[PDB]
Write a protein that binds this ligand. Structure first.
Ligand code: HEM
Ligand code: HEM
Ligand code: HEM
Ligand code: HEM
Lengths: 145, 141, 141, 145
């Protein structure tokens, strides 16, 4: 993955992110933009509209948990596999989420970081982040391979 | 297959892009090349350097095409017939690449229209770009 | 889209399927469930065992729908309107599964029409199924 | 991946496969069915038509090579990653083939096995074969992750 250069850039940027807010926005947008994903969260309540999804308290809370899991991976950029082992078993074995979807969430996170950091979220930084989100998506779909 | 809400969202969003479409188009290409390096294999006769005038030039072209598509939402196969022939038959671009460029555009728009880029708009733009991408890979059994 | 040569290919090919259409539809589903177990999750209250009369039953439904599609190649959206609603809106079927079923269907036909399953027929059938899938995943509202 | 029972099944069947025949047919259908792939074999000559593609001598010769590697992986179902390390380097690092294309060829091969073996290419057998091809595409996309 990343060189020490990239790792440093990535890490510093990460310090500015509010996981609660960014986490809720990212999961909310996944549910809105790729509707079939709503199938996995039937018990979250009302996801009928874009506004419904975005203001849903369970989405906001779940969202935070997802990002927390990202922050942990950020700390272990060389052993992503190990850092998402049990999460892989849950998503693949129990939930049966198609791995393509892990990719979608990764991409949605990038968009959200772009929306939230503007001009600060440079093509170069974005490129490093694409590497990270791809890494995370790989570690999760590992119970599939 | 864009709905009434979708068409409105796309037209509204594009209206916000306004005169920056060319610049956003260029930025989108540049983010694609950096993030998905395998895409550069389609532009060997191009100077892909940062700030390259060729990329900025090509960006403007991509933007003008999207600007046209935004007013032919009912007949995309029609407004981009010629483009489908180029991408599909002449350059035979791998369909996966359309997703990479679409992604780069959304990242670009999000970056410039924070307050305009709502989940509903994001969803519409996404559907729009997927529709355009389908047209450009049409022929392409 | 979907060209004449293609349409002509789809026609004779499906023409050859003739009256085995429902057994093929059934086998296709069976091959899908076995190769891609994630797909079983959409049929929880179905007996998915080999020889199941439910699968048998569903195979028939799928075949009839494909048949209807064959006869309406110029009005696929028109012909499958009802079904996109169901699959996209109601079921929330992940788009990847449409690709799995299409592949399972191509395996089945090839299996049964070795002489008829030529590269060109193969290419047109692929194109066809992709169009159908495009139609069925068009309304995610 | 492959359970002991799955390997036995796959291994037993594979013995009946004529790699020259099946290899040339698979590479040819890939080029015919997924056109963008021709971009990679421009030097093979005429690929202008289906017939052009299927009768191309270089296409045919290349197919055999592809199938030989398959046969080799069939001998090392436990370590496809190691077995395809050199090919992964070639395809990723040098050719830059989107990993999505490794999956398309695997799928075309399954179709071609079905066309050639009819009734003997059972849903069960196809299922074991889907695991093999997924395994192979994965080992080939190694250097991507
Ligand atoms: C990079 C991608 C992802 C990461 C890092 C991630 C992370 C997590 C985490 C940390 C949990 C907490 C488990 C719990 O306490 O229930 C979780 C649960 C869950 N995830 Fe994900 N997830 C990802 C993608 C997805 C996707 C794409 C889907 C479905 C489309 C999905 C579906 C679920 C579901 C349904 C739950 C459990 C809900 C519940 O039990 O309350 N995940 N995920
Ligand atoms: C939103 C999707 C896309 C749109 C709207 C689009 C639009 C355009 C336009 C307007 C042109 C100029 C044609 C002319 O010469 O008149 C063009 C050319 C071209 N595009 Fe795209 N394109 C898209 C996607 C892609 C992708 C994904 C790739 C490959 C990664 C690609 C590669 C090329 C190439 C190689 C050329 C020709 C450049 C030259 O030789 O001047 N395009 N495209
Ligand atoms: C080639 C594409 C497909 C076609 C033509 C097709 C066709 C059909 C038809 C005709 C019906 C029955 C509607 C009725 O008369 O009540 C149906 C129902 C259904 N389909 Fe599909 N289908 C396709 C793909 C899929 C896929 C990929 C999945 C999921 C993996 C799926 C899951 C279902 C389910 C769960 C039902 C309802 C079953 C029940 O509870 O009765 N379909 N489909
Ligand atoms: C199951 C997946 C694949 C396997 C096992 C495979 C195997 C091979 C092998 C054995 C070689 C020749 C190495 C030697 O000379 O010993 C090769 C070369 C090559 N492959 Fe693949 N391949 C696969 C997929 C693909 C795909 C999807 C593409 C692109 C569409 C591709 C493009 C090429 C090219 C362009 C060459 C070299 C051409 C030449 O130098 O003559 N391969 N591959």
């Amino acid at each position: 993955m990343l060189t020490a250069e990239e790792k440093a850039a990535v890490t510093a940027f990460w310090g500015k992110v509010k996981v609660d807010e960014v986490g809720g926005e990212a999961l909310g947008r996944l549910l809105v933009v790729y509707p079939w994903t709503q199938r996995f969260f039937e018990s979250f309540g009302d996801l009928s509209t874009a506004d419904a999804v975005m203001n849903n308290p369970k989405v906001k809370a779940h969202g935070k948990k997802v990002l927390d899991s990202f922050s942990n991976g950020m700390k272990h950029l060389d052993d992503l596999k190990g850092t998402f082992a049990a999460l892989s078993e849950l998503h693949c074995d129990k939930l049966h989420v198609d791995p393509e979807n892990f990719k979608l969430l990764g991409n949605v996170l990038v968009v959200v970081l772009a929306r939230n950091f503007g001009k600060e979220f440079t093509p170069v930084l974005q490129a490093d982040f694409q590497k990270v989100v791809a890494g995370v998506a790989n570690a999760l779909a590992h119970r599939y391979h | 297959v864009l709905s009434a809400a979708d068409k409105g969202n796309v037209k509204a969003a594009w209206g916000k892009v306004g005169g920056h479409a060319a610049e956003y188009g260029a930025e989108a290409l540049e983010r694609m090349f950096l993030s998905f390096p395998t895409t550069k294999t389609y532009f060997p006769h191009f100077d892909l350097s940062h700030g390259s005038a060729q990329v900025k030039g090509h960006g403007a072209k991509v933007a003008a095409a999207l600007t046209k598509a935004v007013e032919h939402l009912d007949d995309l196969p029609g407004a981009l017939s010629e483009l489908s022939d180029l991408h599909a038959h002449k350059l035979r671009v791998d369909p996966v690449n359309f997703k990479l460029l679409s992604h780069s555009l959304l990242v670009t728009l999000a970056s410039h229209l924070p307050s305009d880029f709502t989940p509903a708009v994001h969803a519409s733009l996404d559907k729009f770009l997927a529709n355009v991408s389908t047209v450009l890979t049409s022929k392409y059994r």
